[PDB]
Design a protein around this nucleic acid. Structure first.
Ligand SMILES: [Mg+2]
Lengths: 85, 205, 79, 79
RNA sequence: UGAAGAGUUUGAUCAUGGCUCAGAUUGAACGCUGGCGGCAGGCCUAACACAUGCAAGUCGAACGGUAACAGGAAGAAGCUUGCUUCUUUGCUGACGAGUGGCGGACGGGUGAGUAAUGUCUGGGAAACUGCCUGAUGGAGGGGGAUAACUACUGGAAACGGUAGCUAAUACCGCAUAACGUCGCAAGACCAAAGAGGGGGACCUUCGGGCCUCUUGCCAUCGGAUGUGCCCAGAUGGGAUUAGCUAGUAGGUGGGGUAACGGCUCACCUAGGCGACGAUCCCUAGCUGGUCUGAGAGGAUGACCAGCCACACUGGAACUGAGACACGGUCCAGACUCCUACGGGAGGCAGCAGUGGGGAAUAUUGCACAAUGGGCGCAAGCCUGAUGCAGCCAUGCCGCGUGUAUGAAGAAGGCCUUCGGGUUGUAAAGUACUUUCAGCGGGGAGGAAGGGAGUAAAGUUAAUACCUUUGCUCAUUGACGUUACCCGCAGAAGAAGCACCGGCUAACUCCGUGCCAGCAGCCGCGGUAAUACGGAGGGUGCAAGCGUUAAUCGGAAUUACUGGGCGUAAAGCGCACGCAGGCGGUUUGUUAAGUCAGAUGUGAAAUCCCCGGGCUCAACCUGGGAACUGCAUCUGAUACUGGCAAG
């Protein structure tokens, strides 16, 4: 309905495309780490994990998705790769 | 909101004289007391049980001029206060503004003093009061304001109630504009005919 | 330490989980009579160190499962 | 964002407020953490038309409560 | 500091019982009558459909801006030779739209849904918290574009697509790294911003660094405050609903949320709840309290206040500190609306109104002046929340509609046994006063702030600025031709309504004659009606009175305090008994039952007692007591209860 929401609502569509497109970039470096755990490898599983550790907090401090959900991925992923090899 | 048309025929209903018309020969029958309540006048009043309670509630209402909404508020106030329910009910009646202005000399009758309350004349303790139930606290002066000190009827009133009994619980200057609600009017210095049993036992249900 | 709510064991057909009833008196609120009333609440315990019919001391804890937010502390009765 | 605003429990054309240490976003007068102090603009030598117990504001300033205008009148309209 | 009953079964009576009545109260409607003022109240029914106005905007002290206004500059000029006609100038105040920031997630309105983790009380840990607050520390450098606009082209509108051009606190990199996150350690990794004010020096392309103040911006640890989550107790009817349940119940795991979690997906285990009432259908929002009752107890949840639930009907989510989002988006439909037929707009359970169903419930009100809110460096904007005014006896508490005197006990009305009586001191006539309304004139407080000046020990350039304190002027109300006080008329504008056999306070006559009619029960009317209809007189109440509807009370008539059952309704036809309820007798002992003591806590407002303020009272109000409660420590062992011994 007619208000000054179009300043806000279209911006929520601007922040729909711009934000969610960067979410798959986070999820891309989620997948290959889980692929490396599935691969049985150990050395390259250190590579993409140490690669994604800035990639996590670059979109966890200010950006998309925040508040220690990203920061607890550093725990359980590290807990698996030590149990593998 | 008061009883207007006749006045003494209501005394012919309730037996003894209620002080509505007084000071003159109408004490002894200028209206034939006990002879005509109405058309069927001097008749056989075969009384009942509920009657001898119902007459008393409309005795002391009609001696002061208080209708039924207002008189129950004096009753319900006379339960929360400490002491006898009946005696506080007579104490709360005597502290009424109109009842004080009458028997502190002023006015011929209570209905006149009520009109003298309601016509801006009386003044309680330095304060104008035109409400006929400003219920006076002890050690307070009554006073008539200056612009109605002597108009017609003030000076002829004191002499009539001076043959009446001078009551203990008030002080009064017959000279001018000075009274004192002294202390609580007890049961002894009442009119002594009113039976407080027959009102407390009426409203209790 | 809360009150160390004493209770019993009713049944154990579950995997590291028991059922505890609790004896409890009360004034009946309108008649004034003492009805012995009992409740029924699931209690977490790992060792299966209490059997069906014991007497159990219980405190609360973090809500672990569904329907069960009480850990065992110790047992004061054999079967 | 806790505030020290004033409520309104008066008659018609006869206001009589209440000194109310409450939240910002809540009601006109429907909610408070606690209540201490009162007010009246009908004093005219009735009695004290203000009585506040200033230590409790000195408590709740120490928490960090931002204070409002007509109370900020009162803290100098009392000594 | 508190407790009343009476009428009717029968020819009479003692009992048993019902039905009915006296009381108190309402969001009330209807009938009749109606003068004022204060306080509070006013779609309970279709949550059914909505004309039209309005109910969320703000910062130029983030940005390019310049389309509008206003001040100027510059030039052309009304030449009006100095008074002002225009254009360049974003030059500035200031500002429409668009980027950006925060807030629209509160305030509001409704009670349709929800018998439940929804509410209410008393406990708990496994987490976040925009703004406000405590302390410490940080706060380097770049880059990519793009609407807006420009020029163009699609559509009927709504709207659509391009290249150009510039910004940022828009965003993307990059430098930096704990008392931070991951990690046992070792290690590894992550962040950002300017903006105004003012100038002491120097410099300067004269932009500005430079100095200072204010203030944001970053990270962490606190403190509050708000919100998610858990536990136990307590919360409508129906057992002519007794079985229910597989993601169900539990455990390793991954995965998942801010957080524990069956919150989800594979795997194993086979459970879980239930007569102390599960699933089921029906009905309902819950509490503080209101009403009534002497009390217990009983019906209620409108108003003001707490907490959830819902936005035309079903869904799913985006952003965000916070929503699954009332005046935002999408998917459908449904109505509804509009169309060049291709398409677009719609949501009053916001305030004010129409349709309509209705017994019935109101104005297409005024102001930002108050107190609160939002945005802000304030000014100020905005606010159909609040502050007020009209509407309506709906209710409460006042108040007047005159008071004296006065009979010849008047004409008059009916009664009359024709002796009279009564209305009735009532009226008349003499006395007397104007409350309120009419009408006239002055006339408190709800106003503090703000803005302007001017002073101070402030901190820095010691006097710039700003922050704080005190002083000075001008001030700033919708209500409101206010409350209240004062002035003058002239008894002058101001009395209805039911009942009159019994309960139940008040009675006689005409008319009608089992017809017309009354009525709450008992009942009245078939020629003398204290009951129907009418008239005098009386009663009770009063600006209202009756009637109906609705809850408790009387009802000891669902009885725990407070009943009964041999015949008045009522002892299963009779037996052992399961779960239930209940202990002979002595000692020991524990301390759950209970008693005691405190300490928490029971939100404030109503109820209650002493006290203040409206000329009193309703009403507004200070402090107390009370909130009968639940949870904890300490104490007590007589009763009771589990263990031990007889
Ligand atoms: Mg003023």
């Amino acid at each position: 309905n007619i208000k000054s929401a179009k300043k806000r609502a279209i911006q929520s569509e601007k922040a729909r495309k711009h934000n969610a497109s960067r979410r798959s970039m986070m999820r891309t470096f989620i997948k290959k780490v889980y692929a490396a755990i599935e691969a049985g490898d150990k050395a390259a599983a250190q590579k993409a994990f140490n690669e994604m550790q800035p990639i996590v907090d670059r979109q966890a401090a200010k950006g998309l998705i925040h508040k220690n959900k990203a920061a607890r991925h550093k725990a359980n992923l590290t807990a698996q790769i030590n149990k593998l090899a | 909101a008061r009883y207007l048309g006749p006045k003494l025929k209501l005394s012919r209903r309730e037996g003894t004289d209620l002080f509505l018309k007084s000071g003159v020969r109408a004490i002894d029958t200028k209206c034939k007391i006990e002879q005509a309540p109405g058309q069927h006048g001097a008749r056989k009043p075969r009384l009942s049980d509920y009657g001898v309670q119902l007459r008393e509630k409309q005795k002391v209402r009609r001696i002061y001029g208080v209708l039924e909404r207002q008189f129950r508020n004096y009753y319900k106030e006379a339960a929360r206060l400490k002491g006898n329910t009946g005696e506080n009910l007579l104490a709360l009646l005597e502290g009424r503004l109109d009842n004080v202005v009458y028997r502190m000399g002023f006015g011929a009758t209570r209905a006149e003093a009520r009109q003298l309350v309601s016509h801006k004349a009386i003044m309680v303790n330095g304060r104008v009061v035109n409400i006929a139930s400003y219920q006076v606290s002890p050690n307070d002066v009554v006073s008539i304001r200056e612009k109605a000190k002597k108009q017609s009827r003030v000076k002829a009133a004191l002499e009539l109630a001076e043959q009446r009994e001078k009551p203990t619980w008030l002080e009064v200057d017959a000279g001018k504009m000075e009274g004192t609600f002294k202390r609580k009017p007890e049961r002894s210095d009442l009119s002594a005919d009113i039976n407080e049993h027959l009102i407390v036992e009426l409203y209790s249900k | 330490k809360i009150r160390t709510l004493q209770g019993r064991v009713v049944s154990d057909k579950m995997e590291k989980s028991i059922v505890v009833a609790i004896e409890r008196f009360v004034k009946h609120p309108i008649y004034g009579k003492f009805i012995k009333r009992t409740t029924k609440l699931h209690v977490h315990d790992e060792n299966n160190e209490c059997g069906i019919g014991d007497v159990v001391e219980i405190r609360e804890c973090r809500p672990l499962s569904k329907t069960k937010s009480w850990t065992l502390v110790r047992v004061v009765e054999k079967a | 964002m806790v505030t020290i605003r004033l409520a309104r429990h008066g008659a018609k054309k006869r206001p009589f407020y209440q000194v109310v240490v409450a939240d910002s976003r809540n009601a006109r007068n429907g909610r408070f953490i606690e209540r201490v102090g009162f007010f009246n603009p009908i004093a005219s030598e009735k009695e004290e038309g203000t009585r506040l117990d200033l230590d409790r504001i000195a408590h709740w300033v120490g928490q960090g409560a931002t204070i409002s205008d007509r109370v900020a009148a009162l803290i100098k309209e009392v000594n």
